[PDB]
Structure formats: structure tokens, C-alpha cells
């Protein structure tokens, strides 16, 4: 089978940059196709038969190459170009794809907007208390969330996840959930999430007092 | 407009079989091939095989070792992928995609179907509001959301106001809890000024447990 190897596997660039993604085939192919895929979305055709732009594809995209060496160029990177790009061949069975090249956007530092949510009364009725801390629209991705209950630093009772990069403003968002039993939740007063980030001069604390 | 609409996510036990459907519209179904490609994230994209709807001719990637069978119904413009002797490694998003011409890239792709292969028990989510309050405001904006807790397997989809609200929404990737169940949150930022006049409803769907929940999120009294 023909192995398709892309280089680099990931890159980060600024808006306006010229991006170069290579696709190498283990043996000669007649041409390649390129696809662009956004996270949790189906792939979309980008380039057909090495150099033909797919319908609706902006002119900033172009493809070149022959034999075993091909290149996808994005002439002036835009925030909506955040995606994984795949090359593909079907000159030889089985059809094979490249491993994908993830393109991420570099932008200015943006401080998170911090929001805190106490558990709902419906959840408390079930015997569980989840406290949610939201960090909205920040850059870079690196953020530190600390949970403090009655000013005591928490460990091993939270989980967090970050979104993929925003296609419009190139920021990230993060959600962290502190999960306690209702009995433990009822044992303390002050619930706080303390956020550290490059965009913040000092750590930001959002807190609430249980039953207020 | 060309549309390829697939069947919903499913969970299957190891050794079982799954049949995914792909309903085509907006073009002459018999004039183009229908292919199936899977994606196990992050192990990339793999072609499974395809069918010519006119002739019933099918070709497969040898790797599937005859476990995949691709068929179609020309009277309903639907293609099918059946994968047998399921193994844990078959957990992936399965896409149907149109092969329009040899010189053209696969041009229209279905939304994908996540098939999870597991012996574990399917569990429907509990949906809780993340009410907007004085603790979730930021310079005239308010954040609110829904917490979708304790479900299995993935995926849960979340829309707001039946798809009418999309700006400022963040539906986070799920986290895997110690129990092996998943949890996720979906939030939105809106004007704090109209919390009294606007209605915000999160629509949660977990196809494997046939769960559909619409939860109105109101400001915290």
C-alpha cells in the first residue's frame, strides 16, 4: 500500500502568514487530493487532483507537486483556517490518506473572563454537587485553575477540558468541574476558583458562599 | 443542495455487527459512487470501501478482511455499511462520502456516525442548568449553560434554542470520570440586559440511550 506522510504534523502561525504543508507518497501517484477538517466536523474537499481548487474554496489555497512530492500552500493565513489538513491518493488500491497536519493560529494574549456556577437544586436533590468554573475566550491555551473550599486548596475532586481554537477570534475556553457529595458540599461555605493566566496581572478569584 | 444524512450513534458489544445508513438527496444517486471512510481520533482517516449504485459493484480495503459489506437501495437513494465481528478497535466515526469523478476529491461527506464497541452498560445523561447569576456576569455579558452528567458512551450533542442560538456557544469536549462515565458542559454568553425577556433552552441528545432533554435555563432566584 502507498504510505502518505505529511510534514510537519502540526504548526502554529500568525494571521497573514504563508503556510507550507508537504505530502510525500512512498511510491509515485498520479495526483493527490487535499481535505480540510474542523474538530467534530466531517472533512471537506479543498484541492482535487493536486492543483484544482474545490468549489467555494478561497484563492489563498493552492496545491502543487508531482510524483511523490506535493505541497499545499495557504498564502495568507486566516483565523477560519484553523483545521487539520489531509492529503489523499487513490492511484493505487487501497486509497490512503496522510496523517494530517494541524494548523493553529497565533494571536495576541487575551485574558480569560471567569464565571462560577454553584450546583443546581435539582442536582442537590440527587445527592451530588458539581461546581463549574468557566474561563472564556483566552489566549494562549495555558491556564491554571485552582479550586479552594473555605480557602483550602483542593486536589483530586475536579476535571477540566479546553475547547478547540475558535475559528473567528482564535481563542480557547476552559471548563472545570469540582464534584463533591451533597454531604461534603453542605460541610463548607466558600467555593472559589482561582485563575492564573499570562493575560492576568494577578490571579482572578470568582467565589460564592453556599446558600446565598 | 446535496445532502448525505447518516443514522445516529450506536453502541455495540464485541463480536456483534452494526449497519450504518446514509440517505442521499439533491443529485442523481445512481450517477455517483458512495464510499465509507472511518476516523479513529487520532489515527487519521481510513478508506473502508465503496459501492457503485448503478451496478452494485463494491470494492474494499483488504484490511477489513471481508468484515465490511457495502450495499445500497436505489429506490430510496440510501447506502449502507455493515461491519461484522466488531472489536474494541472498530470504535470510530464512520463517514459516507460521494465519489463524483476519479479526478475530483470526495465532495460531499455525511455528518458521521460514532460507533462505540464496548461490553459496558449504556447510561443516559442527567442534564442540569448552569443558571446565569451575579457570579456569572462580565462587563454587561452573562454566561449560562447546561451540565450533561454521567452518560455512556459518547456522543452527546447540544444545541441551544433548537439551533437558533449559535453565537457565543462553547460545547466542551467530554471528560471521562473515574466511574468510566462521561460528563460535558455547554455554555453561552449573552447580554445581561435581556435575561428577563429571552428564553434559553439547551437541547441535549444522547442517541445510544435514546435520551432527548430540553432544559430551560433561568436566572438564579
Amino acid at each position: 500500500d502507498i504510505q502518505m506522510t505529511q510534514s510537519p504534523s502540526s504548526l502554529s502561525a500568525s494571521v497573514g502568514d504563508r503556510v507550507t504543508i508537504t505530502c510525500r507518497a512512498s511510491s509515485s501517484v498520479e495526483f493527490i487530493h487535499w481535505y480540510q477538517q474542523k474538530p467534530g466536523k466531517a472533512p471537506k474537499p479543498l484541492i482535487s487532483a493536486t492543483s484544482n481548487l474545490a468549489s467555494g474554496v478561497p484563492s489563498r489555497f493552492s496545491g502543487s507537486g508531482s510524483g511523490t512530492d506535493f505541497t499545499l500552500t495557504i498564502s495568507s493565513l486566516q483565523p477560519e483556517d484553523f483545521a487539520t489538513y489531509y492529503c489523499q491518493q487513490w492511484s493505487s488500491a487501497p486509497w490512503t490518506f496522510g496523517q494530517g497536519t494541524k494548523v493553529e493560529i497565533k494571536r495576541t494574549v487575551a485574558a480569560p473572563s471567569v464565571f462560577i456556577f454553584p450546583p443546581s437544586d435539582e442536582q442537590l436533590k440527587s445527592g451530588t454537587a458539581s461546581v463549574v468554573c468557566l474561563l472564556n475566550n483566552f489566549y494562549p491555551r495555558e491556564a491554571k485553575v485552582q479550586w479552594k473550599v473555605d480557602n483550602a486548596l483542593q486536589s483530586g475532586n475536579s476535571q477540566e477540558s479546553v475547547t478547540e481554537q475558535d475559528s473567528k477570534d482564535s481563542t480557547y475556553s476552559l471548563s472545570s468541574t469540582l464534584t463533591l457529595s451533597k454531604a461534603d458540599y453542605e460541610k463548607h461555605k466558600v467555593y472559589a476558583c482561582e485563575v492564573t493566566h499570562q493575560g492576568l496581572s494577578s490571579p482572578v478569584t470568582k467565589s460564592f458562599n453556599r446558600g446565598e | 443542495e446535496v445532502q448525505l444524512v447518516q443514522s445516529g450513534a450506536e453502541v455495540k458489544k464485541p463480536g456483534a455487527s452494526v449497519k450504518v445508513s446514509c440517505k442521499a438527496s439533491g443529485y442523481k444517486f445512481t450517477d455517483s459512487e458512495m464510499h465509507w471512510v472511518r476516523q479513529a481520533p487520532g489515527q487519521g482517516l481510513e478508506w473502508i470501501g465503496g459501492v457503485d449504485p448503478e451496478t452494485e459493484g463494491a470494492a474494499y480495503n483488504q484490511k477489513f478482511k471481508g468484515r465490511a459489506t457495502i450495499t445500497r437501495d436505489t429506490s430510496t437513494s440510501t447506502a449502507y455499511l455493515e461491519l461484522s465481528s466488531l472489536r474494541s478497535e472498530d470504535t470510530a466515526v464512520y463517514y459516507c462520502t460521494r465519489g463524483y469523478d476519479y479526478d475530483y476529491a470526495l465532495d460531499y461527506w455525511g455528518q458521521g456516525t460514532l460507533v462505540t464497541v464496548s461490553s459496558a452498560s449504556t447510561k443516559g445523561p442527567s442534564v442540569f442548568p448552569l443558571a446565569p447569576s451575579s457570579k456569572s456576569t462580565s462587563g454587561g455579558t452573562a454566561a449560562l449553560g447546561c451540565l450533561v452528567k454521567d452518560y455512556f458512551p459518547e456522543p452527546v450533542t447540544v444545541s441551544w434554542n433548537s439551533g437558533a442560538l449559535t453565537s457565543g456557544v462553547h460545547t466542551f469536549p467530554a471528560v471521562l470520570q473515574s466511574s468510566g462515565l462521561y460528563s460535558l458542559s455547554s455554555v453561552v454568553t449573552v447580554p445581561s440586559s435581556s435575561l428577563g425577556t429571552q428564553t434559553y433552552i439547551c437541547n441535549v441528545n444522547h442517541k445510544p440511550s435514546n435520551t432527548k432533554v430540553d432544559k430551560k435555563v433561568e436566572p438564579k432566584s
Side-chain angles (χ1 to χ4, degrees), chain A residues 167-197:
Chain A
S167 301
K168 291 177 180 288
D169 72 10
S170 310
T171 64
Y172 297 90
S173 294
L174 183 150
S175 178
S176 176
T177 302
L178 173 74
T179 303
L180 312 176
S181 63
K182 174 172 60 180
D184 290 349
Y185 177 70
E186 290 173 342
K187 286 170 174 196
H188 303 286
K189 189 175 180 174
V190 187
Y191 288 85
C193 71
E194 182 219 72
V195 176
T196 299
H197 189 270

Side-chain angles (χ1 to χ4, degrees), chain A residues 2-16:
Chain A
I2 300 175
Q3 280 224 5
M4 305 295 280
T5 301
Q6 298 177 221
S7 185
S9 285
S10 66
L11 62 95
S12 58
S14 301
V15 172

Side-chain angles (χ1 to χ4, degrees), chain A residues 1 30-31 33-35 37 40-49 52 54-55 86 88 90-99 113-120 122-123 126 128 130 132 134-137 159-164 166 171-175 177 179 206-209 212, chain B residues 33 35 37 39 43-47 60-63 95 97-112 127-138 141-145 147 149 168-178 181 183 185 187-189 215 220-221:
Chain A
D1 308 4
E30 299 173 320
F31 51 83
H33 296 318
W34 288 95
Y35 302 92
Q37 184 183 31
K41 292 292 184 173
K44 280 183 168 77
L46 193 69
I47 303 286
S48 294
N52 301 127
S55 71
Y86 294 92
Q88 181 248 314
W90 58 38
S91 288
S92 190
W95 300 8
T96 52
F97 293 83
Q99 83 282 8
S113 299
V114 184
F115 308 87
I116 195 177
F117 300 94
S120 68
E122 192 182 350
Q123 192 188 21
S126 73
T128 296
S130 300
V132 176
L134 168 67
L135 281 62
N136 223 43
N137 309 330
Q159 297 193 265
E160 61 172 47
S161 85
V162 68
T163 57
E164 62 269 35
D166 191 80
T171 64
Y172 297 90
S173 294
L174 183 150
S175 178
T177 302
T179 303
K206 288 301 287 191
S207 60
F208 69 86
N209 306 303
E212 257 102 304
Chain B
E33 294 183 6
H35 287 267
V37 168
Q39 185 169 38
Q43 297 99 283
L45 296 165
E46 181 157 66
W47 174 67
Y60 303 96
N61 179 338
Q62 281 170 180
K63 278 183 179 182
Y95 293 103
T97 180
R98 185 177 82 152
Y100 184 77
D101 184 82
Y102 189 88
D103 297 342
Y104 284 45
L106 292 158
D107 58 359
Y108 283 96
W109 291 65
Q111 84 271 24
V127 179
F128 304 116
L130 297 174
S133 79
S134 68
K135 303 301 184 298
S136 76
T137 63
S138 167
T141 71
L144 58 107
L147 176 60
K149 189 179 157 64
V169 174
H170 296 301
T171 296
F172 291 86
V175 290
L176 179 68
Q177 303 175 94
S178 307
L181 297 175
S183 284
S185 59
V187 306
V188 57
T189 56
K215 179 68 82 190
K220 208 166 72 73
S221 177

Side-chain angles (χ1 to χ4, degrees), chain B residues 1-4 23-29 77 98 100 108:
Chain B
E1 176 211 35
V2 174
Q3 292 181 262
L4 296 190
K23 290 178 208 295
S25 57
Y27 72 101
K28 185 113 187 286
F29 185 68
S77 302
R98 185 177 82 152
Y100 184 77
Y108 283 96

Side-chain angles (χ1 to χ4, degrees), chain A residues 141-162:
Chain A
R141 192 166 35 204
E142 299 76 24
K144 194 175 127 283
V145 176
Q146 284 192 127
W147 283 103
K148 290 170 181 172
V149 170
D150 285 345
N151 215 237
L153 173 63
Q154 302 299 287
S155 65
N157 44 10
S158 58
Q159 297 193 265
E160 61 172 47
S161 85
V162 68

